[PDB]
Amino acid sequence: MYLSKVIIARAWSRDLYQLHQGLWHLFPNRPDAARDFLFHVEKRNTPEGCHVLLQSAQMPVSTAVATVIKTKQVEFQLQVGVPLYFRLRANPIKTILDNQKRLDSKGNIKRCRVPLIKEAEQIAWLQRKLGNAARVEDVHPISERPQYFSGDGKSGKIQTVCFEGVLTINDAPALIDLVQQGIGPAKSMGCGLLSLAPL
RNA sequence: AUAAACCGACGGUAUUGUUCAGAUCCUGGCUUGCCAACAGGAGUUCCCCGCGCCAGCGGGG
Numbered sequence: 001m002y003l004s005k006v007i008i009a010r011a012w013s014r015d016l017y018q019l020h021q022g023l024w025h026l027f028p029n030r031p032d033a034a035r036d037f038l039f040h041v042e043k044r045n046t047p048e049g050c051h052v053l054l055q056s057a058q059m060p061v062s063t064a065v066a067t068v069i070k071t072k073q074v075e076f077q078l079q080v081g082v083p084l085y086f087r088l089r090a091n092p093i094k095t096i097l098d099n100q101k102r103l104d105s106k107g108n109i110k111r112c113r114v115p116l117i118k119e120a121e122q123i124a125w126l127q128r129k130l131g132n133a134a135r136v137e138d139v140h141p142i143s144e145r146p147q148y149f150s151g152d153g154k155s156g157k158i159q160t161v162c163f164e165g166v167l168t169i170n171d172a173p174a175l176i177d178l179v180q181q182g183i184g185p186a187k188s189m190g191c192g193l194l195s196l197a198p199l
Numbered sequence: 200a201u202a203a204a205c206c207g208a209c210g211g212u213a214u215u216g217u218u219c220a221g222a223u224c225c226u227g228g229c230u231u232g233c234c235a236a237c238a239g240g241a242g243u244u245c246c247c248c249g250c251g252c253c254a255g256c257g258g259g260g
Contacts, residue, residue, distance in 0.1 A: 017260085020260080033259085035259090035260095091244095093242090093244080094255080095255055095256065096242085096243085096254095096255070097252085098243075099243075100243080104246085104247090105246085105247075111255090112243050112244060112245090113243085113244055114242045114243055114244065115242060115243090115244075116242065117241070117242050118242080121242085148245095149245090151260090152246080152260085153246085154245040154246055154260095156244060156245035156246080157243085157244045157245075158244075159244075185257085185258090185259095186260095187258095187259080187260095188259075188260055189260085
């Protein structure tokens, strides 16, 4: 597992799709299939590009558009019952089936993921996702701008929520699994990266 | 097919050498951009795949 800080040129950073496709070229294997990586956008505006915190299973190699600043080999050593700081940009949703009777490819009724617009439901979603791995001691749900994107031929939305707070570890391997694999949908759109720190 | 018809105005040639546009000059003095203002109602968020479905839960992009 490798943790890095990467910057992407503005000309290759208009949509989250462009961020994904641009970050992709740091690991040349086809088809891996991958992503074996997660990332979190901290600064969105140029120059030089957009700053990103990239967790991966390989060592990134800088390209023309994607520039690595620092790289780290890291082993998460988590102890039980220890208070920690956490940050997680996530996509809290509810899969429901459409009030409009739109049709998918199979001729059945289409489903839609909808944002949870109430704090209680978001926090409930969070502690639910964590489960027996950890218990949320304190949480700040930061409301973000709705993100839009393009490609391949579809224009869609990703409403994100940025959780920042304190938690306590109950089970370490489960939490390591949560960090490594990611939490929630839109993992390719810069969600699911759980960042931890000591207080 | 007409004072028409047939029917070259043709050949040869550096415009050349010399030349500071120079010296003098504050654009200065006087100026509030002020008065009024919840962003809140909203769970739609576009494409696949697996398992559910008076519910929905996930995995990819």
